[PDB]
Amino acid sequence: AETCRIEAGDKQMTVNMGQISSNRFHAVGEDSAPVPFVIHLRECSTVVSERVGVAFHGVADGKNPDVLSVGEGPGIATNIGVALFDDEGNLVPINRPPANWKSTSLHFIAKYRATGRRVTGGIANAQAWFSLTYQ
Amino acid sequence: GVALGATRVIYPAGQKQEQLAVTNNDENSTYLIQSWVENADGVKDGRFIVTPPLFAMKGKKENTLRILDATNNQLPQDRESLFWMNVKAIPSMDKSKLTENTLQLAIISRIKLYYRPAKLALPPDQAAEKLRFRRSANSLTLINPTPYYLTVTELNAGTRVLENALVPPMGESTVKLPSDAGSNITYRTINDYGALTPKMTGVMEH
């Protein structure tokens, strides 16, 4: 059997996160607006797509290991990470073992989550690997 | 988008290499393809070499990954050993930088790589029926007396579906039994070709 042909939103698999308004974050753990994205599992048997576990891997924020780091440097935002959620509002912590759900479209949500007391503005890009582990 | 030609690789001991197809079906997409093998714990493991380890797929095409045995014959000869084949597809198309912040994704497909000794006596297509079961009040243990990993799925106790289980060769795996689990066990497996095997009735140990 073939594995699933994985496609995202656009062909570049880039999720547009918008812009950071630093003065909107007031407490550690506060989340910005939801950014939905979908990952499609195409051209594979339901025998296969029903039996795949998924995980997000990346460099974690230095204060919150469950969310993605936006990096460091001049003009880079501080004290926020990129948090990932399933379509039921549950956090999907990064760098965890493959996880299963119970369809060939996985709907996720990305948000900026405050990881420190005083958030500062700037560019807030993140990178992740979406891994599918086949049974 | 990128797919692999199989959902597992059976590596026959003694072969210099094993092939795995990788395809892109989209004329308007280009990917970098990066491949490597991990051990059962997910740690990159040099005992298998993948060539080419990194290459470009521009548009619609099929390519062949070659997995090379570099174990120096050190793996067990009486049972399969479990590795993970990893194929990363990096979208490599000329995008344009926006004012927008972005979350950039890449995809990794991970499939089992079973190193299979030569000259095993029991045929692979007779392994699934050898599974046995041991039952307590709150748990069910699966017993695999064969040299092959068994990927057990659609495991039912009465009407209650249980967790899937990977049962190691000459080993055991345990799953939880909910309160309403019935006494009639049935199961299937995923075979060498990624297919579901026939529904079988679970036989209790001894």
UniProtKB/Swiss-Prot annotation, chain A:
The keyword Acetylation does not apply. It is found in: Fimbrium. GO terms for cellular component: pilus. GO terms for biological process: cell adhesion involved in single-species biofilm formation; pilus assembly. Keywords: Disulfide bond, Fimbrium, Signal. Disulfide bonds join C4-C44. Its main location: other. Belongs to the fimbrial protein family. This is Fimbrin-like protein FimI. The lineage of its organism: Bacteria, Pseudomonadati, Pseudomonadota, Gammaproteobacteria, Enterobacterales. The chain holds residues 40 to 179 of 179 of the full protein.
UniProtKB/Swiss-Prot annotation, chain B:
Changing T174A: In strain: Clinical isolate 149 and O2:K1:H+ / MT78. Keywords: Chaperone, Fimbrium biogenesis, Immunoglobulin domain, Periplasm, Signal. The keyword Hydrolase does not apply. It comes from the Bacteria. It holds the Pfam family PapD_C. Its main location: periplasm. One of its GO terms (biological process) is chaperone-mediated protein folding. GO terms for molecular function: protein folding chaperone. GO terms for cellular component: outer membrane-bounded periplasmic space. InterPro entries: Ig-like_fold, PapD-like_sf, Periplasmic_pilus_chap, Pili_assmbl_chap_C_dom_sf, Pili_assmbl_chaperone_bac, Pili_assmbl_chaperone_C, Pili_assmbl_chaperone_CS, Pili_assmbl_chaperone_N. The keyword Magnesium does not apply. It is found in: Periplasm. Required for the biogenesis of type 1 fimbriae. Binds and interact with FimH. Belongs to the periplasmic pilus chaperone family. This is Chaperone protein FimC.
